[PDB]
Amino acid sequence: TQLGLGRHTMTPATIKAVKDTFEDRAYPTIFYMLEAVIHGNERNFCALL
Amino acid sequence: KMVPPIPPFLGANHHATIRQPVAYHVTHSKSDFNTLTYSLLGGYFKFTP
Amino acid sequence: SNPTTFSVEAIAAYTPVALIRLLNASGPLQPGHRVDIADARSIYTVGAAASAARARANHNANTIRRTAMFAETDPMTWLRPTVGLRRTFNPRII
Amino acid sequence: SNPTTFSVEAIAAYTPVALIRLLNASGPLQPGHRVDIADARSIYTVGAAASAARARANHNANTIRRTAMFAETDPMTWLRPTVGLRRTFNPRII
């Protein structure tokens, strides 16, 4: 609390959405497959926009 | 990252009008966006007698 | 295409594999025969990727040719800076 | 235009440059030859702008001519004030 007085904080909307998507158990495995395959290449990401 | 690069053909810090403390004021104050502007205007007042 | 002749799996099988949307794996198998196998696996996917890239063949009367995507030479760059596309549009050309 | 003969880039090149929507630059070059060069650059630019101003040619059958823009004489101004169009309308005449 002492460090974060005037520093940037996150709005409650994105906190609610992000908490829901880490607590989602019906998360599709398609996202895991695509994240495993494109594997952080800019050439692979921008080819699948 | 620690010294602001201002080339000597464009005026140095210790000769210019706007100096380092005004920059340190504007980058390290987290109060508001209205009172920051009025405080910055309260900065820009001459110290001539 | 001849003579090898068709993949019945078996083991060989034939590396292209020039079929489209094959429900041959399932399909019957039924199951695989009594051979040791090691690849099998690799030569199947190598042929399958070819039998999708060559199975493209058409749909190029709808493209909209691929481009440089990012910024790169383009061997002149001395009278025209280079900018590529972000592929967000719909290539169909009608 | 002729005989000069055609900009093959090279550095001559030919100063207009009377083509439209050219996929000539990129395009192959591939790359430029063994010459001195600096300009090139300006001669290309003045030719390209002129080959777009001339490439208008039509679309003036859709104008709706340009107007006085701002308030200026209008060489009488002694029986009528002057006020120009602020062009936010769509000029097409149809």
UniProtKB/TrEMBL annotation, chain B:
Protein name according to UniProt: Major capsid protein
UniProt source species: Human herpesvirus 3 (HHV-3)
Name of the encoding gene: ORF40
From TrEMBL, chains C, D:
Recorded family membership: Belongs to the herpesviridae small capsomere-interacting protein family.
Function: Participates in the assembly of the infectious particles by decorating the outer surface of the capsid shell and thus forming a layer between the capsid and the tegument. Complexes composed of the major capsid protein and small capsomere-interacting protein/SCP assemble together in the host cytoplasm and are translocated to the nucleus, where they accumulate and participate in capsid assembly.
Subcellular location: Virion; Host nucleus
Name of the protein this chain belongs to: Small capsomere-interacting protein
Oligomeric form and interacting partners: Interacts with the major capsid protein/MCP.
Highest taxon of source: Viruses
Residues shown, of full length: 14 to 107 of 235
